[PDB]
Structure prediction request, 330 residues.
Amino acid sequence: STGSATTTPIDSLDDAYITPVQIGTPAQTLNLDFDTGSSDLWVFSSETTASEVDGQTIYTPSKSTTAKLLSGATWSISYGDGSSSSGDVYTDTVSVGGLTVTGQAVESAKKVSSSFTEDSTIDGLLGLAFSTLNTVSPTQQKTFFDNAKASLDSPVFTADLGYHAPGTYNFGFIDTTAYTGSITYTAVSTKQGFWEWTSTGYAVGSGTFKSTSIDGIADTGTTLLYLPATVVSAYWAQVSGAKSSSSVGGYVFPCSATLPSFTFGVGSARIVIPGDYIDFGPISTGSSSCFGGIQSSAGIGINIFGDVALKAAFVVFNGATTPTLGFASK
Prediction:
């Protein structure tokens, strides 16, 4: 089997991407944030505190003939941006782009933090990291990908995110029409539960490539690119007037600037992030100070190849017995 679904930016800045997911019988379609940095599939639901729902589409398990309470199971998760949610668990039928899993753990939110409430376009998250990070207790549950894996033509999924445009998540096959040149594969460590790999270095604009190992995670659920302070300083030093602002919470730059590209290494291959991808617009409406899309990972504890990086590539998440990551230009 295979699946193929279109993923769409939630706003004009590509702050996140939503993908339609069918849950239950008859189908209830929710727009979920596919997140390769977490491993819970959780949804706004009929059980979510009413005051914490503001425009989201909810899952109502009582209206699904295939929903079953997973008795005793609860979940609770906190993300790197400080947001959180929690609740109980149903099993139900879940389909993504024609690919169907029966008995999928659907985590029903009783509580969500303000960040989620305030985002009316995201109805939940679908985690695609390794199942070892799943927060369901007392019986840990498997991700959609893990459940689907054995049925897939090939044990892979791919992320093809658009710049200011729709893209695609495919399950079980590699679309050879979706990228240019070759795919370069690189080793993955699952020791922390993430798609963790080591980039071989970077360049700023037309500058020379610096060979240096940068350990980080491929995370579709993080908007920006978070790298070591040394790297990020080298990038923003090439933008007149750019500075790190503690009041704003990172590097800002004059909205009148033209940003340089940023290149990162995958083995001997290179992925180029165009400068436009690194512009996240005025810090506040009407401001002439703009927010940068490359920020320091210092104090996060890990480097994060988020959407800014990943949308410049066709990315293969290979879930074979020895997992790997593949990157191609497109």
Remarks:
- Residues 5-174 form a domain with the Cathepsin D, subunit A; domain 1 fold (CATH 2.40.70.10).
- The first helix runs from residue 114 to 117.
- The CA atoms of residues 258 and 275 lie 7 Å apart.
